[PDB]
Amino acid sequence: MLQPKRTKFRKMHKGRNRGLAQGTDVSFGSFGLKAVGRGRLTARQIEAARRAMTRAVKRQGKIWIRVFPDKPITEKPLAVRMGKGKGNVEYWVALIQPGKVLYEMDGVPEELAREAFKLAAAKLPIKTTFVTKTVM
Amino acid sequence: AKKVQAYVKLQVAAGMANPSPPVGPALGQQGVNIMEFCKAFNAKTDSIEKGLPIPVVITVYADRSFTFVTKTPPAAVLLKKAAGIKSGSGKPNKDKVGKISRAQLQEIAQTKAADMTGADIEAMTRSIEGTARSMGLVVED
Amino acid sequence: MKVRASVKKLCRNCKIVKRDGVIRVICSAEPKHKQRQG
Amino acid sequence: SRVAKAPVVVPAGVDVKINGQVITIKGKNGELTRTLNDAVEVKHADNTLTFGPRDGYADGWAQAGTARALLNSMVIGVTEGFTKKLQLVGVGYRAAVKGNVINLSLGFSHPVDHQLPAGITAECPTQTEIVLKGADKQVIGQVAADLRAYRRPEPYKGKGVRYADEVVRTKEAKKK
Amino acid sequence: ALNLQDKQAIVAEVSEVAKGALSAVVADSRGVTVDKMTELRKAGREAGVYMRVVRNTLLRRAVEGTPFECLKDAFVGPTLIAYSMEHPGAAARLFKEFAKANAKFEVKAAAFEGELIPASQIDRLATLPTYEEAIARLMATMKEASAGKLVRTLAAVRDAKEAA
Amino acid sequence: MFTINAEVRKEQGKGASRRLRAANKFPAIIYGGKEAPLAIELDHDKVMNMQAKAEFYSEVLTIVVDGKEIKVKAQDVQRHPYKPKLQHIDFVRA
RNA sequence: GUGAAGAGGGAAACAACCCAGACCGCCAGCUAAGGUCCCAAAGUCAUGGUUAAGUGGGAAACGAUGUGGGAAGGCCCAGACAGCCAGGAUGUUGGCUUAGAAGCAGCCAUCAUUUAAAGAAAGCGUAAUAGCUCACUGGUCGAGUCGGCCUGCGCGGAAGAU
RNA sequence: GAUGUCGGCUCAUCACAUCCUGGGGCUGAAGUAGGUCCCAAGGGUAUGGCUGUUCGCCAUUUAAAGUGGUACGCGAGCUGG
Numbered sequence: 003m004l005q006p007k008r009t010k011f012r013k014m015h016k017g018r019n020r021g022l023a024q025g026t027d028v029s030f031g032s033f034g035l036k037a038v039g040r041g042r043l044t045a046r047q048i049e050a051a052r053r054a055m056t057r058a059v060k061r062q063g064k065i066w067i068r069v070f071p072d073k074p075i076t077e078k079p080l081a082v083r084m085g086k087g088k089g090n091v092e093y094w095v096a097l098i099q100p101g102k103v104l105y106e107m108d109g110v111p112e113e114l115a116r117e118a119f120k121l122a123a124a125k126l127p128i129k130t131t132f133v134t135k136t137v138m
Numbered sequence: 139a140k141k142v143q144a145y146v147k148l149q150v151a152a153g154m155a156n157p158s159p160p161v162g163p164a165l166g167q168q169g170v171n172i173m174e175f176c177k178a179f180n181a182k183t184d185s186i187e188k189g190l191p192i193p194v195v196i197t198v199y200a201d202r203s204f205t206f207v208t209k210t211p212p213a214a215v216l217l218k219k220a221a222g223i224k225s226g227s228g229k230p231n232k233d234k235v236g237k238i239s240r241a242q243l244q245e246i247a248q249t250k251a252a253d254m255t256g257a258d259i260e261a262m263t264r265s266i267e268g269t270a271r272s273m274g275l276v277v278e279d
Numbered sequence: 280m281k282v283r284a285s286v287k288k289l290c291r292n293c294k295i296v297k298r299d300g301v302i303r304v305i306c307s308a309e310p311k312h313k314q315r316q317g
Numbered sequence: 318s319r320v321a322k323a324p325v326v327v328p329a330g331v332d333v334k335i336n337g338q339v340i341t342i343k344g345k346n347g348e349l350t351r352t353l354n355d356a357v358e359v360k361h362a363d364n365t366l367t368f369g370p371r372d373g374y375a376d377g378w379a380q381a382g383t384a385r386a387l388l389n390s391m392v393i394g395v396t397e398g399f400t401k402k403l404q405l406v407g408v409g410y411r412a413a414v415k416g417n418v419i420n421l422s423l424g425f426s427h428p429v430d431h432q433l434p435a436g437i438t439a440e441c442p443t444q445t446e447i448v449l450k451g452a453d454k455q456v457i458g459q460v461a462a463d464l465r466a467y468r469r470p471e472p473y474k475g476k477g478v479r480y481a482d483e484v485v486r487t488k489e490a491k492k493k
Numbered sequence: 494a495l496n497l498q499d500k501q502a503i504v505a506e507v508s509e510v511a512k513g514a515l516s517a518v519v520a521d522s523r524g525v526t527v528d529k530m531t532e533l534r535k536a537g538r539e540a541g542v543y544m545r546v547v548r549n550t551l552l553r554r555a556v557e558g559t560p561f562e563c564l565k566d567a568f569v570g571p572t573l574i575a576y577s578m579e580h581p582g583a584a585a586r587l588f589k590e591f592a593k594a595n596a597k598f599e600v601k602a603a604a605f606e607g608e609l610i611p612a613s614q615i616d617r618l619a620t621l622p623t624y625e626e627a628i629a630r631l632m633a634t635m636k637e638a639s640a641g642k643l644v645r646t647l648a649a650v651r652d653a654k655e656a657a
Numbered sequence: 658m659f660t661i662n663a664e665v666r667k668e669q670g671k672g673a674s675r676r677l678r679a680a681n682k683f684p685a686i687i688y689g690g691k692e693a694p695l696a697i698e699l700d701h702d703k704v705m706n707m708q709a710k711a712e713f714y715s716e717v718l719t720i721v722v723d724g725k726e727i728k729v730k731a732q733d734v735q736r737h738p739y740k741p742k743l744q745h746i747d748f749v750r751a
Numbered sequence: 752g753u754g755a756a757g758a759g760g761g762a763a764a765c766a767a768c769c770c771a772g773a774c775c776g777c778c779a780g781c782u783a784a785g786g787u788c789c790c791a792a793a794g795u796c797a798u799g800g801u802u803a804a805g806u807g808g809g810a811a812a813c814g815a816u817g818u819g820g821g822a823a824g825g826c827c828c829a830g831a832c833a834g835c836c837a838g839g840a841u842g843u844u845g846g847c848u849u850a851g852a853a854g855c856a857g858c859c860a861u862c863a864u865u866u867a868a869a870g871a872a873a874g875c876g877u878a879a880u881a882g883c884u885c886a887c888u889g890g891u892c893g894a895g896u897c898g899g900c901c902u903g904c905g906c907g908g909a910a911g912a913u
Numbered sequence: 914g915a916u917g918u919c920g921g922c923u924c925a926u927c928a929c930a931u932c933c934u935g936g937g938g939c940u941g942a943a944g945u946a947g948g949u950c951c952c953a954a955g956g957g958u959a960u961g962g963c964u965g966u967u968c969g970c971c972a973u974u975u976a977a978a979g980u981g982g983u984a985c986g987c988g989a990g991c992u993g994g
Contacts, residue, residue: 283907284813284907284908285814285815285908286815286907287814287815289874291873292875293816294816294834295815295817297905297906300907301907302815304815308874308884316906316907316908317815317907
């Protein structure tokens, strides 16, 4: 998984949100990997993507991460009753929002980072796109 | 594919140019015959020394007939001799067995001016430097 | 061949060509990595 | 197609004629030879025909390099033909010509009567090696193609009729 | 014009460095063999002779945007060009050291400071006197057209004996 | 040191702004300096594939609208929530 | 909202969908959602764009030299890019190891050199020493080609009880 | 207002993602034998035991010992342990 050092939360809701979280632009680098659709990432995937991109590049600048898990999510046992109660905590989720930018670089040479992120997109559950900033 | 290249390189001691094992396979593949190569090799003045590998490079045409250019001694033999050594360092750049002076390398380079193509007397020194370094000689005057 | 999809490049004369709707890597001296689909 | 837009490499002493998408090569030497290329745009010029882009069964120039290639193919066909030195590796398999018919097998002591169409003939110096004669670049390989289609060569060590592109490519086992 | 260091850098430098040369020898490439030219810049720098291997694609425009040595027969097809600004006899003597490894008869024609020279007549140089007498034997039009062409016919016995 | 063009536009409303995005055009604005917020339209594709150059932002801008050019430098970007096309750019006069 | 407490129209249909709110009668007409080759009422629609796969008209990741369009871009008739042919070089059959181990058996030097040329080598290879393709050079070669990106379409992923 | 169950037998049948021969690619396959592997539903596709048992354990057959489904197939079929 991915996880923080301390917490204030422990048994949060499934987390459906009305729409967006406003991060659609490139702002941490000059290029990135764009979400271009909504979903879940289970903390395990974030680690895998950052892990994946560093194995391709061998760190030739700095890596920017724009995804973090926040809500714990419960599951119940596959055998008995679901709906009645709320089971143990199973996994921690980052909710990815549409058009939201996932991973960025600038210090790394752009054509190598682009290849690093294409490879890292195969670890993702749905389609993504390379985005270039072209602006301040 | 072409199965026979031009200007095939060989470097062999005068006493090992007729038996096959020192030579490996390569002469046999390039259509050339080991006794004939031994006569053609015999012909130059400095290609008489036994145990000292003298470079000779032969060009073979399309019918397996070959014609032959005979050449002055290599840098590898003169650097080994000039540094007082008889044996390299193994792995160089970590292990070193001697040193060779810059003036010795330009006199060596003159003995090589028929097997070397470099422009200045310096160019010729520059190519043969890395020969010395492989055998564990520090290049400094 | 292997049953795998997504064709890869492994040598200089990977021409990669679609025969009756399955993409094969080409080999001419090395079919040790030839594929069927992609 | 860069190659749809070539000099076509046919002389004027071969007066090649247009017939819609059917193209017929005519002139001096050989036999009367043809080619079928669909979904193309054709200008006639006189005998160095010019091929350009179309969409019908082509994607845009898909056949236009083809037609250009195939017209010169037919032209080389009438002036001299193509390669013909055909060969086999292994023993028992035969490639041995006896008249009209070329005798070969899967390994066995009886042949499978592979026979030539008219306007091509063959003969053999030795029972492995074949010299094929005629006046089209299509046909000498077309009889070559059905000849390998009864015993194929074998990936590591060749065991069958080897022409142009062939099944024996060989491969390593050790290094490291 | 310019887009490269290896091809386009060499259209404005092939026939201007040899309109610039006292002798040049314009020979057939992929028939002199490329190897042999590399194992002969061994002896070639110990004479002051420069040799480039150069395509008919750089020669086909050396005539426009740029000047040429008034020859075009040896510009067509694959082309080697050997040339000197020092001791003119050496460009052609270098062209005889070729038969040991492949063949020396590979000259098509020659240029000399601008005048077209046929391949029967340029071996007078490849004898190699002193530079001065090599200059005496052949020039461009400044002298060879003037007084040399009568020597050429009265001395059809040998090429070395023909002079300018 | 890039060269773009624009056409004159003024909108406040939902129906108008959507009718640009429906058809692959979007708005931007050049504020401060000698003049007021000037609202303009731009094209989706003139900044995406007509250009993949860092100079739009690192260097000055020639922007042509009604034969005017004033020199401009870029400010923060707003991006589309479902594609990598440009939803809106802000600019300051330079 | 609709069904529940609504007919008809369209949807392989139902008790809830998309359109609408059945007074009835009318061999009248229009419009809606929906349709327009035949089943079946009207477009095998005119104009441009693209796929050769029954994809269309079942769906993802995804990958690649499958393919096109488009503006910006390296090369761009002064001649390309890939490829096929040819050279594939000089010190270097360097040092160690070894029959040979010579970029390519293993390990270290992984460089230098004449340069209009060749990486102390990208890929292969009789299983290894050999041999080989390969850019760049020079043949073939006289017009497009490929990387980025936006974008149409293809591909395999996409195998089940009548 | 429920179609009547297990295990075994009767009786089968349909989906092919084929147990097998058959055509064909690869192999870190020398040849051979194998592994790998696409194409393909046509046909053939075994039997006793102890136990109310599937599975179990044991012996055997054939070149061979399959995949998957059927109101946990079929009680307006059989037994009824």
